[PDB]
Every structure is written in structure tokens, then in C-alpha cells.
Write a protein that binds this ligand. Structure first.
Ligand SMILES: [Mg+2]
Ligand SMILES: [Mg+2]
Ligand SMILES: [Mg+2]
Ligand SMILES: [Mg+2]
Lengths: 36, 67, 188, 128
RNA sequence: GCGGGGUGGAGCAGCCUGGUAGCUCGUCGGGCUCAUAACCCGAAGAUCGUCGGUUCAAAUCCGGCCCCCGCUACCA
RNA sequence: UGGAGGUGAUUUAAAUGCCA
RNA sequence: GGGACCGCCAGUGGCGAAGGCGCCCGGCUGGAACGGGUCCGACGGUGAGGGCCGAAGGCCAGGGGAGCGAACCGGAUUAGAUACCCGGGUAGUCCUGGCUGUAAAGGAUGCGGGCUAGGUGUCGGGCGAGCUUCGAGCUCGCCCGGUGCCGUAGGGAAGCCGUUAAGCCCGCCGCCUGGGGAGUACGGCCGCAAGGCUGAAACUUAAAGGAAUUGGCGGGGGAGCACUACAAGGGGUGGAGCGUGCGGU
């Protein structure tokens, strides 16, 4: 996903793995969701 | 039942509340009569007392090198 | 109890080649049952001088003639703690596993081992292994079965591998370890 | 001769212990004692105490039928699990001889594999 | 054709086997922490719809009446 | 003198905190 | 009767471009180091777009399904617990022909050349002395190669590097230019799918990030205490009426 490794530092945010997985659940959508 | 064994050395005090005492004693009579074992006792003891025990085969569990 | 108290005390014999020397007591009711149990005993107990204490042997019965089970050889094993006391750091064991057969037709599988004094690269190792296989092949063509098992476990072949393998590199405790039988021939 | 002999297998665990007194070849059982038979609590199912008790009673049977002296064979579950013997070893063997039966060759036969199968847990261990 | 419970503020436990409504969420209050919640324990709390019978004696075994009422006659 | 690497072990139920 | 890995010797040990590679024997097969008064005669470094390999995971089929087992069904635990613990168990892991081309793919350090202190081990080869059960062995020097540690000149914000530079000099190449909104948006390109490569802007904020320094703390580790701590003992308050101090009305 063209990683940018300044984000994993978990300082004032949330994990990165479990944000990727949630962006997929919306790209799979705006692709499927009447993006036809 | 009445078996006495004689205290020949005090070794240390264990127990979560500092109560038992590591003491290597000798049995004096019986099917053993001469084997020297390892036990923890409750109360105060002096080197040279005459303790009774009741199993002559319990072999109490070892200490952290007394220290 | 009768199930217990109806048993009957058969006796076992050392196999014939060792020289019959009684070993062990076994309880059993009817002679059809005790014909495929096995035994383990040392070598010390059967005409054994102590320092062969760490050898271990096996016989299996093959017959029941009136309170006698005449045994038959089955195998041989060393002591695991014993060899454990050899392989230390900077020692580089050497393994060898081989199939041979015998004049009289018994074919067997043996697993003999050496231990060097140091570490050595393979091109001064594998030659040892080739040498062992060679000087065993030749050996197992002239001897009957019973006599072959005699002298290896007597402690004799060791004094020959530990002779023609030294001619590459100094070593310690060369010897054979475990012997397992495979089948038995068609003749006789 | 007149030398009746036998073999005692002793199988240990973290959770119980087992004693098996047998004939010479090993195929004919004589007396069998466990840990779950004598004591009750499952804290002390592995204690050395039940070990002793059952392991004196075992001799107290096998001593009548005719067994005199014994060889020992100790073993852990081993295999694809823990390799350490239970602490009940000296809980039986120290006391077994004390029950008057002799001692011969004594050995553990702990089964070890040359690269056996997969252990439990997996990539994170028993994550207590 | 029937047929069931007829229960504290709430789950109704407990009914031939007969004397203590029987525990459980909830209401008052007391403990521990610094203070809160979890946690602990006393208290309140109906007393079996109701008229009875049987029953020394009761929801306990049997009935009058009535609360609510829960299953009564489908596969092209 | 100080580490530099490896194998094992490594423990019930324990949540949260106005105002300058 | 089966299926799946090859224990301990094992070594900052070897082999490879990187991912990786460890039971034994026979065949086939690529590369590197060394020793070489051998031969060809500048035939080189990098490298846009291009082309190949690339753990595990998913998927196309066909075979195989021991142990291990997301999904899924049970008992626990709990204020709850769809998580930790336990008993089972589908897909996968396994074999043949494929597409996927994703990693902390980490020496977090692109690749070639010259030079600039000394110390200390260890694998290969070789040369030189000694021994030597004379063995393809065992010591000790010295030359050339890989893999380790300590530390001068110098260098860096400091952690620290030190001829295997992060020092000083000559080449070519790819990226970065507060922080998020964002690896999203719209558009094209390969994929059977899951997805992968290319990648902006409006606006919002005054700073996010690094290296070290004292202290507080730690359901981190050592050393040492105390009847306002426990252990071991003696006597009590809580429950009654009353004296007396607060709360509140
Ligand atoms: Mg960065
Ligand atoms: Mg509170
Ligand atoms: Mg816990
Ligand atoms: Mg390019």
C-alpha cells in the first residue's frame, strides 16, 4: 500500500495493521458500491 | 507413636511468616537408628533437645541454601 | 486369586552359542502362549566380567519343552547414558549404518560409531566411513551367523576399525553399538 | 536358582503417577497402583506423599505372590511433550527399597524423538 | 374435550416427601479504597387468588368459587 | 576489565480520577 | 498399516546475487578463494524505460489428508468477555502444473576504485621450522582471501564508526523539502480474485519527530528496616443505655 513507516510508532494514534484492514472495507466498497 | 530423634544442627528458618526452622537431626532408634535427615520444626529449639516425630520417613523439602 | 494362582513357573535358558546358562523365571499357564515373549539381560550376568557392564542383550524364545524355553538371539543394544558420556563439545561423532548378510543366510542391520579427537572436515571424515564399510563387508563373508554375533559383541571388531581408521587420524572409542536382525533364511 | 525376580515400570507426570509391577519378560502384570486411587485432592495428586503411599502398598502386594528383587524402569510422558521427570522419582525409589525389595539395574527409558512431531501451543506458548 | 400457575418491587425457586415463603436481581443502611464502581454483610420485604375440605398439624393431599387465562379438528 | 550472542523457563481475580 | 520432520556434534561455523540451504550412498551441475615467468590485448563502472528470481498467505485445478489446527460447537473466567484457560473439530500445512510478486524483504547502511596506526581469535590455501603411534597428525611463525571484538588520527547533535567507515579523494543512479486530511480522491495500466504499480487538491494547525540529563514511579531486580507492618501472645471497640464532638434538619 506504499507504506510510510512514520506511523507505526503508535505514539498518539492506533496500530497500523488494524487501520489498513479497515480502509480495505471501504475501498472494496466505493468500488463495488454503485461505482459502476 | 513415640519415636524420639535428637537435634544435632540448626540450619535456617523458612515459612512465609518466618516460623519453620531448617534442622538436620538424627534418629536414635528404630529400623533406621542412625540415619540423619532433614526437617523443618515449629517453635523455638536449642541444639541438644530431644524431639519426637511420627513418621521417620518424610524427608522435608530443601531450602534456598539457608540464605 | 486363581487367575494368578493357576500360573506356572517356566524357566528360560541362555541361547546355545552363549553356552546354556539359566536366566529368569516366567509365569504362564499353557505352553501355546509363551512363545513370543522376549528377554533383556546384560552381558555381565551371562559369564560376564564387570567392565562389560554397559552392554545389553536380547533373546527371544522359540520352543517350550517341559519347563524349558531354549532361547534364540534377537539383538543387542548399548547403554544410552554411556554413549552420552562420550559425545561432548569439539568431538564430531561418526555414524555408520549398514546392511550385511551371512554365509548361512541371516541378513542383518548394524549401526557402528566412531568418535574423533577434534573437529574435522568431511573430506577427512567420509573416508573413515568408507573404510568401516569396507572392513566389515569382507568380514561378514566368512563367518556363520552365531559366530558373527559372538565376536562383535565380544568386543573384537572394535580393535580393527580402531586400527585401520587410525591410519587417517587419531581417535578414541571405536566400536559397534546396536544390532538388529531382519529375517531368517530358507535353508535348514 | 530359587531367585524370583521382576521389573517395576514407574510412569510419572505433572498430574498423576503410576506404578506397574511385572514379571521378568514384562508381559505378565502382577500389581498395578495409581495416584487417583489413594489420595483425593487434585492439588496433591502429584505430591510425593501419595507417591509413597501407593508405592508402599504396591510392594505390600507383590511381596506375597513371590517377587523378591526388582529392576527399575522409570519414564516420563516425554515424546512430543515435556522431557523432565516428575518429582515423584525419589518419592517412589527412595521408599521402594525401604519396603525391603532389593535393587538391581536402574534406568530411565525416557522416549526422545529425532525430530518428532509438532508440540502444542504454537507461536505464542501457553499464554497465561 | 380441556387444561395450567394461581409466587415479595422483579426469576419464581420450593407441590405426592407435613410444620422455618427459598434463594436470586432489585430499595434503605452499615464495611473496605483517597474516592468511585466491582466486592462484603445486616434490614426492609410477600407469607402461597380466595371459600373450604382432607391434614395433631400444610402450597405441600383434596374440592367451592373466581384472576389471567396456555396447548382444542391443514400436506397440490 | 565490560559485554557480546544462544537454550529454557518466567504466576488466580485487580476497571477509572474536577479546579486554578 | 500408515503419513510428516531429520534430535544431540552445531561452532559471531561454512555455502549462496537476495529470499534460503543440515540423515546416508551413486550420477548430473553452477560459482568463489588459493598456487601459476601460461594466453587474449581495454574487451570497463553504472544503468531511464525494458527482462528475469522472489518465505509464509490467498486462488485454479487434480492427488494427500498423521500430527498441528483461524473458521465453527461445547465447559470454564468474569460486573461483561464475542479475548486470555480447557475439550473437540472445517479450510490449510503435505504431492504434480499454475497464476499471485506482498514483509521489521532489517547490516534499518545502494555499487565499483586509491589511500590513512597498532593489538587480538577463527575457516581455506599455501610457504617455512619443529616434533611426531610416521596418520591425510600435532605445535609455532609469515603471505593472500571471509567471518568477530577492543581501540589511535579523524568524523557525528550524540548513541557511536575506526582498512568489512558513518574518514579523505575521483564516477554513475534512485529518492526527500513542516504536520494531517492521505496513501484517500478522480483517470490509466497488468490480475480469474484478493489486490498490486502511478498519484494530486481544497482546507485545518504551531509544531509534531531525534540523542542524551536529573527525578517520580514499576502487578521490574538486588541490599535494609519498623508492634502506628505481619508472625507469636495479652486486652478490646463494632452490638445495649448514657457523657461528650461532628454531619444534617
Ligand atoms: Mg523515516
Ligand atoms: Mg463505594
Ligand atoms: Mg491471571
Ligand atoms: Mg531504471
Amino acid at each position: 500500500m506504499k507504506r510510510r513507516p512514520r506511523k507505526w510508532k503508535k505514539k498518539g494514534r492506533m496500530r497500523w495493521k488494524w487501520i489498513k484492514k479497515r480502509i480495505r472495507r471501504l475501498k472494496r466498497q466505493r468500488k463495488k458500491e454503485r461505482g459502476l | 507413636e513415640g519415636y524420639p530423634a535428637e537435634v544435632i544442627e540448626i540450619i535456617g528458618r523458612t515459612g512465609t511468616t518466618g516460623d519453620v526452622t531448617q534442622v538436620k537431626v538424627r534418629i536414635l532408634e528404630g529400623r533406621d537408628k542412625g540415619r540423619v535427615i532433614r526437617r523443618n520444626v515449629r517453635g523455638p529449639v536449642r541444639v541438644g533437645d530431644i524431639l519426637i516425630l511420627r513418621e521417620t520417613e518424610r524427608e522435608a523439602r530443601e531450602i534456598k541454601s539457608r540464605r | 486369586k486363581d487367575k494368578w494362582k493357576l500360573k506356572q513357573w517356566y524357566v528360560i535358558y541362555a541361547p546355545d552359542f552363549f553356552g546354556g546358562v539359566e536366566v529368569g523365571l516366567t509365569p504362564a499357564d499353557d505352553p501355546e502362549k509363551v512363545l513370543n515373549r522376549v528377554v533383556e539381560v546384560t552381558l555381565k550376568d551371562i559369564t560376564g566380567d564387570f567392565l562389560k557392564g554397559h552392554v545389553k542383550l536380547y533373546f527371544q524364545v522359540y520352543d517350550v519343552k517341559g519347563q524349558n524355553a531354549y532361547t534364540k538371539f534377537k539383538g543387542m543394544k548399548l547403554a544410552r547414558s554411556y554413549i552420552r558420556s562420550l559425545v561432548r563439545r569439539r568431538t564430531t561423532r561418526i555414524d555408520g549404518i549398514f546392511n550385511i548378510t551371512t554365509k548361512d543366510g541371516y541378513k542383518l542391520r548394524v549401526m557402528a560409531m566412531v568418535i574423533a579427537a577434534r573437529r574435522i572436515q568431511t573430506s577427512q571424515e567420509r573416508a573413515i566411513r568408507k573404510i568401516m564399510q569396507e572392513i566389515i563387508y569382507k568380514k561378514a563373508e566368512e563367518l556363520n551367523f552365531k559366530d558373527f554375533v559372538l565376536e562383535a559383541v565380544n568386543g573384537k571388531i572394535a580393535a580393527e576399525i580402531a586400527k585401520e581408521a587410525k591410519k587417517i587420524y587419531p581417535l578414541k572409542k571405536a566400536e559397534i553399538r546396536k544390532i538388529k536382525v531382519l529375517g531368517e533364511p530358507e535353508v535348514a | 536358582k530359587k531367585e524370583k525376580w521382576g521389573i517395576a515400570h514407574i510412569y510419572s507426570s505433572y498430574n498423576n503417577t503410576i506404578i506397574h509391577i511385572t514379571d521378568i519378560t514384562g508381559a505378565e502384570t502382577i500389581s498395578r497402583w495409581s495416584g487417583g486411587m489413594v489420595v483425593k485432592a487434585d492439588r496433591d495428586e502429584p505430591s510425593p506423599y501419595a507417591a509413597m503411599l501407593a508405592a508402599r502398598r504396591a510392594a505390600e502386594e507383590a511381596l506375597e505372590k513371590g517377587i523378591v528383587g526388582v529392576h527399575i524402569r522409570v519414564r516420563a510422558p516425554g515424546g512430543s511433550k515435556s522431557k523432565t521427570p516428575g518429582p515423584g522419582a525419589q518419592a517412589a525409589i527412595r521408599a521402594l527399597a525401604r519396603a525391603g525389595l532389593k535393587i538391581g539395574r536402574v534406568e530411565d527409558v525416557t522416549p526422545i524423538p529425532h525430530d518428532g512431531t509438532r508440540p502444542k501451543g504454537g507461536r505464542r506458548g501457553r499464554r497465561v
